[PDB]
Amino acid sequence: TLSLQLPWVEKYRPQVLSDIVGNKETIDRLQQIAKDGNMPHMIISGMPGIGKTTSVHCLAHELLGRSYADGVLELNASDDRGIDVVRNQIKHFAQKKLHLPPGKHKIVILDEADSMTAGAQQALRRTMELYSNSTRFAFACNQSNKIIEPLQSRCAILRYSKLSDEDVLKRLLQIIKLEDVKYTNDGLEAIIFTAEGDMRQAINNLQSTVAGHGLVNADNVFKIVDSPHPLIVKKMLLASNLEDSIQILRTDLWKKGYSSIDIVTTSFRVTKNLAQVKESVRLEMIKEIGLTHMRILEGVGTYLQLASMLAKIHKLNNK
Amino acid sequence: SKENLPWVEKYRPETLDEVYGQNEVITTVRKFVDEGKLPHLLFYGPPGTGKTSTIVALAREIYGKNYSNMVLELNASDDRGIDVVRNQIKDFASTRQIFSKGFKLIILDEADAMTNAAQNALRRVIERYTKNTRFCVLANYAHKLTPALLSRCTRFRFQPLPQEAIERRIANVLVHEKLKLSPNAEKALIELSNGDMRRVLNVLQSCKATLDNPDEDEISDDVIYECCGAPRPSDLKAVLKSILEDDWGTAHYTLNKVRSAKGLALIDLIEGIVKILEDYELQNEETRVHLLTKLADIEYSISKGGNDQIQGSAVIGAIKASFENET
Amino acid sequence: WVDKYRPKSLNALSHNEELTNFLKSLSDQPRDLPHLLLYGPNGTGKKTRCMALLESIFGPGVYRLKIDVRQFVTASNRKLELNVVSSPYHLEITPSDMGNNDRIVIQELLKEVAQMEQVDFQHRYKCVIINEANSLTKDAQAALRRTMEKYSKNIRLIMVCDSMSPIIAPIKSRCLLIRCPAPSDSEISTILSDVVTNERIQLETKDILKRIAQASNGNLRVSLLMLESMALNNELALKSSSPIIKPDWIIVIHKLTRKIVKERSVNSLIECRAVLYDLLAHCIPANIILKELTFSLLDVETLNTTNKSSIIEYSSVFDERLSLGNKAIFHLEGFIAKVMCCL
Amino acid sequence: SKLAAEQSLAQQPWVEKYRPKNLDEVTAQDHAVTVLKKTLKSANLPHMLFYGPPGTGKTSTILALTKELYGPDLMKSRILELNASDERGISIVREKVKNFARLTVSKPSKHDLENYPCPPYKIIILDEADSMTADAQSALRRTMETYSGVTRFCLICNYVTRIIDPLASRCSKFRFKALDASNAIDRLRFISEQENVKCDDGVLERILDISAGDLRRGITLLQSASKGAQYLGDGKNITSTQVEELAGVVPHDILIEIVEKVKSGDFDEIKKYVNTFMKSGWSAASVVNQLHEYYITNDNFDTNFKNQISWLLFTTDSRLNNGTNEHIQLLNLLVKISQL
Amino acid sequence: GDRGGVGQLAQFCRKTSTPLILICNERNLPKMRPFDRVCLDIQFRRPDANSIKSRLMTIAIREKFKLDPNVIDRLIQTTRGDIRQVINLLSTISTTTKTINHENINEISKAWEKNIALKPFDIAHKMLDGQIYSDIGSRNFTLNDKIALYFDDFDFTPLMIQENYLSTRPSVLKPGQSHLEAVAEAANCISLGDIVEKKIRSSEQLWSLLPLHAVLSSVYPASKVAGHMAGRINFTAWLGQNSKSAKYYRLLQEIHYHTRLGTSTDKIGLRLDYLPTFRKRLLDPFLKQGADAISSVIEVMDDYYLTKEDWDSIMEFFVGPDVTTAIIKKIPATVKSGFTRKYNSMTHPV
DNA sequence: AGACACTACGAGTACATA
DNA sequence: TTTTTTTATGTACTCGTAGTGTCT
Ligand SMILES: Nc1ncnc2c1ncn2[C@@H]1O[C@H](COP(=O)(O)OP(=O)(O)OP(O)(O)=S)[C@@H](O)[C@H]1O
Ligand SMILES: Nc1ncnc2c1ncn2[C@@H]1O[C@H](COP(=O)(O)OP(=O)(O)OP(O)(O)=S)[C@@H](O)[C@H]1O
Ligand SMILES: Nc1ncnc2c1ncn2[C@@H]1O[C@H](COP(=O)(O)OP(=O)(O)OP(O)(O)=S)[C@@H](O)[C@H]1O
Ligand SMILES: Nc1ncnc2c1ncn2[C@@H]1O[C@H](COP(=O)(O)OP(=O)(O)O)[C@@H](O)[C@H]1O
Ligand SMILES: [Mg+2]
Ligand SMILES: [Mg+2]
Ligand SMILES: [Mg+2]
């Protein structure tokens, strides 16, 4: 063991906008924008692992050509992005002179824009407004609500959605063809099922299964990757009998090493995002789940507390 | 010398072959490191399952005896903020190794106590520096980690140690130490562990110290139960039978004499009665609802103190009122 | 006045002779004395008995005390300034004058006085009187748990409280427990006779004094103050039918109870919330408000046993809620709404 | 030096005067001190977690163990006692505790190795670990897991649930049992004999009966009864009534009056008697305990009534354990148990 | 804050010889409070649809882009009065789709919806809206949206709910349940959310319970009493009452620390017991004995180390049938003048 | 030798927290 | 249609007395 290889998420990271299997509308929009030029300020939002950072990187690359190194200013959440940085470095880059083609502009990529402080976000307003003819801003975040409305008013809003099973399946088939990996339909279906619209997680699980077992089969996938956590919790809460929910909680969750805090948090989230039952029933279930969580946080987290929570939920469902 | 360390620390695995229980994870990790394709790891599991030992033995297999120098190991004991990330982790990832050639390893042990800003700053460090360094995040609760950081690592769930693995480790210890163990005593030891090797090792050391002999005798179930102060199944079932069948005064006297002759705790008796009544096939689930609710309430009240006699009488009355509906 | 006539020694007490003899027993050997916790009804005379016991443990100079100012710094730039009542033989601390920052004051001041040795030119230890130990949060009590045992040769605690419910079990175990039962109406009337004989009050009938006792519920602090108050309305000459002067908050609570029992609606609930706000804004605790409102609602003869049982049940429930909460009005309005729904 | 300490002990309260100095003075907690004595000859002391009711002797046990291990000389240099009267946030745990654990063990003198085992590790005890925040507790994990070669951790608490699961897994759990009459009558009789406490036959066993598994409270009550008997100077023996009158126990006749008021009577007279009873200061916890004992031990009530009385007493005790008003809770309990 | 350029500009707005124009997006802010009465305030409101429609037609015919006037109204109402966002939307969508009349406007509006946080008063209106909790409205404004509503401002939403939850007309009353029962259940859930909030903002920093406090304090009491707004949405008065009670507690603490030398009682034990007699000792001799009862009051206040400010603060604690705000005005001004004159003349031992 | 630009460690002030 | 709330560690900004290398 002297050197390692690049992971398939980084090795097969798309370098052109055509290789992105995400939202076709926004991808074609960015393709036409990069082909014609005049890229405006944009804010790309969505969920992790759907192709937001790669999208803006490919856009900037194909738009700037060889001038990417001197025309693109990349700032992540790992670097200081306070009011002082926006005042000095971002302003110096926006005021910096650079002879570009008559259809391009300097791009300022700000990854994880939902983490910038309010002062920096406020100072960026006039910084992006006074130099909007030679400097363009592209924000990439997960929550558009964390960015102030004045900043959102000066840019386009691109909301990336979850990747359907078709797109992730197509990308996985392309990766398999480029890697020559023996697979099976049930294995790919299990990978898509455990990915939950997360392309990066899907590729990571695929690489793990390949390097751990060689053959991509549903058996090996379920052996190396457990079933999704929220779905088992939903099946436990939606049980019709108390015995079935108790058996599910015992075998699937408690006997597999899931902590009580994770169980109660997943139960709260599932009941909040549930739609099968009425609003009042969901409110009573959330009330009971919170009453249980208040005991779980105090160090009384055991199997008896979760059993009592399930019993109270079933008593509520017992009309 | 190692002969002064406690049994939990003395018997810490130094190679990947001494980590029992996890076979699907250990084999896949060995294949990862053999073929070279080692992704970012996320070891999620309960305490005492062998995550820290696994990653330490892995770093030892990767770098040799030079593990303590070619690996950046951060934990909750060390200050882990956003500035700590920005300086230490980025400077460790960006530069090269001082002693040999190869990728670097950042072991963020117990990273479930990190700040949200620290994880938001680290999620782009993991994605930017990924050709010369690696990240291994150890966690007991997967809810304290942001989904962005949670999606960048390959998740390995450390299941609780099964019967065979704990029995194998117990046999290894009984070979390493001049100690003998009874079969039923071994089964009772497996029962009070819940897949925790730390508890098994600690109580094994305690029962070896309890023997009071030059270790020419065997460790029976009585020694174990008197060491961990846990109630015996015999007294457990006797108390349950006296509660279910005998009168109120008789059940009260039985519970009092059982909990005062051996010095047992009410919480242990409650847990044992809950475990026993789980196999009881009963009528309409209303009795189970009442039993679970009242027992959990009594447990939560015990977790804050109070009158032990009042709580014992409450347990008796709750069990009786719950089984009064199963008729 | 209640201050002009107050006992200064153990031989000057006029009620609970058994408690006086027990205090003499406990003060016979003063150096072999453990920590003490005086508990009982509010206004029995435990704060006077503690000072009388200190007057037997030390010289008469225990009452010549002075108020000094001490400052503390929290984890931030915030500063706390509190007044300590100190004496050449003891000191008095009342952590009920601040919020959750009582633990810092407790630990720092107690460690300071423990490491500090007494001075001369006036026995061996310096007593600390913790007034109203019920306001001490669980953190400060836990901090004092080990301070009580680590320094037992220089610091002896005499904690005065009204109910051992909020006191943790370790602190209860770490000190003797002394109960101070409220004096009977006979002893209260006897003290009232003496104080009106000294203050030159004109009484046509003596039984009125007994009525004052029956209006104080064993409280001497309320009894004497009410006697002096009704002596000012009757111009130093109490009549045979002199009215009983009740505090303003008691009359407000009675009017609130009347409004509850007469009308039960949301429009009345708004007025109830307004009255509760006016009561809370004028330095009246919410636990006392709830207790008095419940006791006044139970006295209403228009209700039956079924109503009173539910009333006291909701009262206990919301008392637990208020003891677990901080926004007192959020629980008081809920209790009032539940009572309205019950009736 | 030594004589000054002897005189100071002789002029201290009986709780601190008779504090166990060796691992032999502890009477009832034998299972833990047996392991503590057997590990004294060896050198593999593990991380320990003492938990149990208050007044069972956890702090005394760890102090006696540290003494028997290190001697009165190394006792002040190889120990780190952190109580609840100090700051124990994340900052303290990260700086001070970790710096002390990373320190090397102090070199023993020539006189130390001759009489004491002098193990190659030091002990960092944390008394009253219930007040430690969960983050400061999780910070101790690797601190105690990596520096185990040079330091040993001893957590002490009353509620084991207040400590996080990883810390409870890293430390070996020692549960201290309640000190009832059977396992503490020897210690109580020894304390009474050493102080010439002239008592009757069934006094000491009664004292611990009021203690409910608490030897500190029993010793304090014994000292109070001894002071009350020496002040009188009558030369007689202390009786169970003289002990129960100062222990906060309600007399039997007052309890029979309460039972008669609950059995026969409506809301009004019950409320009036409760208001009169609250004038005489009694702790509602003791009243609830005595009512529970009377109702459960009496062979005159139905099982259906006994289940309900047990649940009601449990609810009342749980509500009283939060600092509620004693009068309201007692009245509610008596009214609820009056309605069948 | 106290230090910053905001106050400097506020003071500059008072002394200047050159016009000073100020532009801001949020006016009703605490930091913007010094600008309340110093500069002429002008409010730019939601623009009309006609001018924006004409401008859009112009920039559309100029940019070779097809657009009907029937879509501009929807574009504006989804944009919520921002011509800049409308222009950016047109420039962004025109590059691929050159015509948007009635077909692709649904996805355009669903993708460009303005996710703006509501003011602490609009959250009270939306929370107490009975249509949202109906069977049809529940599957449109889901529970996740209701919790995000609270999370928009989690410092005022529970207080705003508790303030005006009993001032509405409920339309979700279950068959057999009156308004009082729903109000009592809402108040019980308010108390439970109070306990949860106390557990959150206390030691151990249990902030992970914030979503639960969302339901118990805001969502459930609103759902129990959702309906029409009877009157107006009243601002939470708990803050002012808390400030007043804190000030009164400070004053009572000063009074107790002044008279501790004589009372030897607690703060509450003095407020409940001593003040009903201190009032009749100090103030009552003024109503019956004219101006010759001054020496008695001075001696009484000296015997417990009272002050003039303490005397004025004592008379403010009494409520109900005993209010001195008119009794002090009934006192002849000569008596008060003589009292305050004798106060600054005789020496007082602290 | 000394004055004063450059500077980096420290006390104070707020601001969030799913 | 509008004002406030105890505390606990992490984060960011600011002034700022201070310690030392340098130039008129
Ligand atoms: N549409 C896609 N087509 C192909 N690969 C993709 C796609 N989306 C994601 N990936 C893979 O996922 C990796 C990481 O994607 P990212 O763009 O970083 O995720 P993200 O959408 O930016 O969400 P974040 O960064 O967690 S907020 C890429 O390097 C690709 O390997
Ligand atoms: N699979 C295992 N095989 C052998 N010994 C084990 C195993 N798991 C745990 N142990 C023992 O338990 C000790 C502690 O293991 P750790 O890996 O530190 O526990 P953990 O999985 O990291 O859980 P934490 O540290 O509480 S989050 C080791 O030193 C071993 O002695
Ligand atoms: N087992 C015991 N044997 C003899 N005396 C004991 C025993 N347990 C307690 N005591 C007495 O009680 C006193 C208090 O002992 P501690 O060890 O402080 O009690 P504790 O277990 O620490 O209770 P806490 O501190 O409230 S958790 C000792 O000084 C002894 O006098
Ligand atoms: N034995 C007694 N004889 C006469 N008056 C007493 C006696 N005990 C207490 N008092 C009166 O009680 C008043 C003080 O009450 P206090 O002790 O503050 O109430 P609490 O017991 O709530 O602390 C004094 O003014 C004093 O006159
Ligand atoms: Mg991204
Ligand atoms: Mg670990
Ligand atoms: Mg202790």
Residue numbers in the entry:
A (entry chain B): 4 to 322
B (entry chain C): 9 to 335
C (entry chain E): 4 to 125, 133 to 353
D (entry chain D): 14 to 353
E (entry chain A): 432 to 781
Quote from the publication.
Sliding clamps are opened and installed onto DNA by clamp loader AAA+ ATPase complexes. In contrast to typical AAA+ ATPases, clamp loaders are heteropentameric with the five different subunits called A–E.
To reveal how RFC:PCNA binds and responds to DNA, we analyzed two classes that contain DNA-bound RFC:PCNA. Therefore, we term these two states DNAPCNA-open and DNAPCNA-closed, respectively. Both classes contain clear density for p/t-DNA: 18 basepairs of duplex DNA are bound inside the central chambers of RFC and PCNA, and 6 nucleotides of the ssDNA template extend through the A-gate, preventing its closure. In DNAPCNA-open, both RFC and PCNA broadly resemble the conformations seen in Open1 and Open2. The RFC A-gate is open, with all five subunits gripping PCNA in an open lock-washer shape. However, both RFC and PCNA constrict relative to the Open1 and Open2 structures. PCNA constricts ~12 Å upon DNA binding, with most of this constriction occurring in subunit III of PCNA.
